[PDB]
Amino acid sequence: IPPIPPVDFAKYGEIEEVPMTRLMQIGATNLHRSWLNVPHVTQFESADITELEAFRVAQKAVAEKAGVKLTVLPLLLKACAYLLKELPDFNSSLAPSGQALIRKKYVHIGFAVDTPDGLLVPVIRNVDQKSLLQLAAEAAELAEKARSKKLGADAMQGACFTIASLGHIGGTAFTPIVNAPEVAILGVSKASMQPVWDGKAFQPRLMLPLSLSYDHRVINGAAAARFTKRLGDLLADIRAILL
Amino acid sequence: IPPIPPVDFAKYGEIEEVPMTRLMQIGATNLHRSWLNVPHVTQFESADITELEAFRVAQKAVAEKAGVKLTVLPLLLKACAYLLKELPDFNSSLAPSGQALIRKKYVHIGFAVDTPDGLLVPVIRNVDQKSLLQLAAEAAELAEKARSKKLGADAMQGACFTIASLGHIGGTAFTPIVNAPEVAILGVSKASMQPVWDGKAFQPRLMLPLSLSYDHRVINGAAAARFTKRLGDLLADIRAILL
Amino acid sequence: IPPIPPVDFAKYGEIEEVPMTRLMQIGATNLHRSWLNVPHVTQFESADITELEAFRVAQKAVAEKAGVKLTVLPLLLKACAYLLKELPDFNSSLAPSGQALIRKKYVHIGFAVDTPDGLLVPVIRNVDQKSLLQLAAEAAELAEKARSKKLGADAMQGACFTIASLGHIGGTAFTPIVNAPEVAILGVSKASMQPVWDGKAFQPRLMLPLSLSYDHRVINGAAAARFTKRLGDLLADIRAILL
Numbered sequence: 001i002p003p004i005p006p007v008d009f010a011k012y013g014e015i016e017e018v019p020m021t022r023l024m025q026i027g028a029t030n031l032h033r034s035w036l037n038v039p040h041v042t043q044f045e046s047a048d049i050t051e052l053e054a055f056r057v058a059q060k061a062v063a064e065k066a067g068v069k070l071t072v073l074p075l076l077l078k079a080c081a082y083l084l085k086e087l088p089d090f091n092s093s094l095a096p097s098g099q100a101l102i103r104k105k106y107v108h109i110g111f112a113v114d115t116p117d118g119l120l121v122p123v124i125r126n127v128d129q130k131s132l133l134q135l136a137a138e139a140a141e142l143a144e145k146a147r148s149k150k151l152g153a154d155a156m157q158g159a160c161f162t163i164a165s166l167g168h169i170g171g172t173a174f175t176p177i178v179n180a181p182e183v184a185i186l187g188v189s190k191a192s193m194q195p196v197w198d199g200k201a202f203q204p205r206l207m208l209p210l211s212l213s214y215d216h217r218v219i220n221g222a223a224a225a226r227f228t229k230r231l232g233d234l235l236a237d238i239r240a241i242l243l
Numbered sequence: 244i245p246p247i248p249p250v251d252f253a254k255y256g257e258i259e260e261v262p263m264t265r266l267m268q269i270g271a272t273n274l275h276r277s278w279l280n281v282p283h284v285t286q287f288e289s290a291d292i293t294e295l296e297a298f299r300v301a302q303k304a305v306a307e308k309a310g311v312k313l314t315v316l317p318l319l320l321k322a323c324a325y326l327l328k329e330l331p332d333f334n335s336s337l338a339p340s341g342q343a344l345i346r347k348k349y350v351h352i353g354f355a356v357d358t359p360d361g362l363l364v365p366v367i368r369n370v371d372q373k374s375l376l377q378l379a380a381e382a383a384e385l386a387e388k389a390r391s392k393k394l395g396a397d398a399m400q401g402a403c404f405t406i407a408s409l410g411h412i413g414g415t416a417f418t419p420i421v422n423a424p425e426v427a428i429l430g431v432s433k434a435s436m437q438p439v440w441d442g443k444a445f446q447p448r449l450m451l452p453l454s455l456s457y458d459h460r461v462i463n464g465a466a467a468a469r470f471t472k473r474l475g476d477l478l479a480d481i482r483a484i485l486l
Numbered sequence: 487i488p489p490i491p492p493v494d495f496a497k498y499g500e501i502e503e504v505p506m507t508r509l510m511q512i513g514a515t516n517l518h519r520s521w522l523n524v525p526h527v528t529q530f531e532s533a534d535i536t537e538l539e540a541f542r543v544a545q546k547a548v549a550e551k552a553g554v555k556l557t558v559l560p561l562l563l564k565a566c567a568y569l570l571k572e573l574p575d576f577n578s579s580l581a582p583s584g585q586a587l588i589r590k591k592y593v594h595i596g597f598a599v600d601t602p603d604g605l606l607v608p609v610i611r612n613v614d615q616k617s618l619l620q621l622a623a624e625a626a627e628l629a630e631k632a633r634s635k636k637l638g639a640d641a642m643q644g645a646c647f648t649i650a651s652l653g654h655i656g657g658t659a660f661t662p663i664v665n666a667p668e669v670a671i672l673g674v675s676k677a678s679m680q681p682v683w684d685g686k687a688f689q690p691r692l693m694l695p696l697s698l699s700y701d702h703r704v705i706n707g708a709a710a711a712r713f714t715k716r717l718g719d720l721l722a723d724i725r726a727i728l729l
Binding site: 001032033034036037039040041042043044045046092093095096098099100101102103104105106108125157158175180181195197202216217218220221222223224225226228229232 | 244245246247248249250252254255256257258259260261262263267268270271274275277278279355357361362407409412413414415416417418419420430432435436437438445447
């Protein structure tokens, strides 16, 4: 692939060289390898989380009694695990022969933690089997170990899917890059009060922006549209996970 | 381009190998070839289809008398054909010498049909010359043949542009991949009632999300912004196609 | 990278060959080189410019007395220059060794001008040091020279960042391509009156759509979300640039 021509940046003013941590360099390589290997499409959707939010906030007592903080992330992890089982092509990878998908029968999900040294994506194993306060505890632990460089490379392996949440900082939507060999990554941005037509008038609903990027070789437009539609449906009423 | 390292997925749990149809493999190759060849940009726009929708629904009698279903797709195909003639760089392809555009003087448009075996994009020839009930009939036929594997490879050729509609499933917008050697593809998502400022107050208008991806080597930002603006203008009042 | 198969386009109808200006061909090459080199992510945000707009319009007298037109572009250039200093990783480039960032201590910003011959991106040097009417005058001059082929290649060099504004034509958002070796580009689309929840009811605020594409090897999701959040914050109240 043609390289970018070097420029003498100091011809234009003062420059300074800072170096990249080995973590950034690793990260840089993996993103570039994914970019050139995966033809990316991003499907955008918004989910009504007004009732989910009310639930979160009411269970503040129980979560503190348990010592966990219950954010949107365990609710997101539980719903994507239910969906990764319903729509199995999202829980799979392209076999190196280019002619088979390896469908995984397990659901481990990674989530992006941005640390000073670079991006880490710890993996919670068997998300489909853990409860909201279990995933809350564990997500929190893995993030603290990630920040404190105590995350062992074992916990960075064998994910089937990645959630990347930037809702705590800002933004309306973004187009994340698939962590190949996974086949999809869910970006989540900031929730806002939005007018939503109730058939007769506009009601304020709290809306969560979702950005699903996927590997278009494995997932086609209709399948990905159906995945963010079911996810918006499960987040609007998380009780559907019970049936 | 650096390959993705193989992972032993069975170290993490049970896996299963399903194979890809030849159609998926073909599709996989073509998308990857487009991805690496076309520097992609997506221009997003929303079009007011309140009046278009009213028209569609009122002509339900005539369409049933004709045996056709009149969806948004023939209305979309007629407007893009008028525009492909107004803005001819969208109806062209980059010559293999890298230094000429081949402007096509015909308008054939493909539309994406997602079938079990994979994606098919049948082509309606000379969309600029057919009427809304003619394109309605023909689109329906080609889709049935596509699903029923009776679509002959002849009808999959020589398109100038592609419409990919996922409005029947969901989503707010997506970033489609250009089917090279074409130079653009229109993605269409779900219509929603939206408040739109009338100069004095917010009126509910039915808004259609449009996502134009284009080949930035051939089309620059201003030209693509002008294309989705004219398309939003023609869909808001389809009578402008008459003049 | 696998080439696109040639098609005999004349099998389908009349075709015509128009040639590409040398400018388009140069442009075509540079975009393709960026595309294959930079793993791109776009972060979308909206900024409340109601008060900025009021200010613009009230200073119409002063700007005309000075002979300049004061558009949104000098306001945008001043805010990104303040931010390029606050968040220095956006004002830097990846060193050819792949293992260092060259942080620039100067702020020169380019802006996209679409001319008949192709795209030109003139550079205003030391944007951080010039005033709103100075940047207004200079932006206007450079654009006229760009259109009139009088722009000397000197003024097309050593930019740290690019603003690409299509707000004067249309669109809701787009995904621009990073001009490598820069690490980010801000796309700006059309402002619309939008309902924005004031804690109790929806107020019409004039909202500007921002689309920040970045080089994900150098900038991670949280940093880019923080950059468009600070930019939305500075545009909502440009007086924060004074402190």
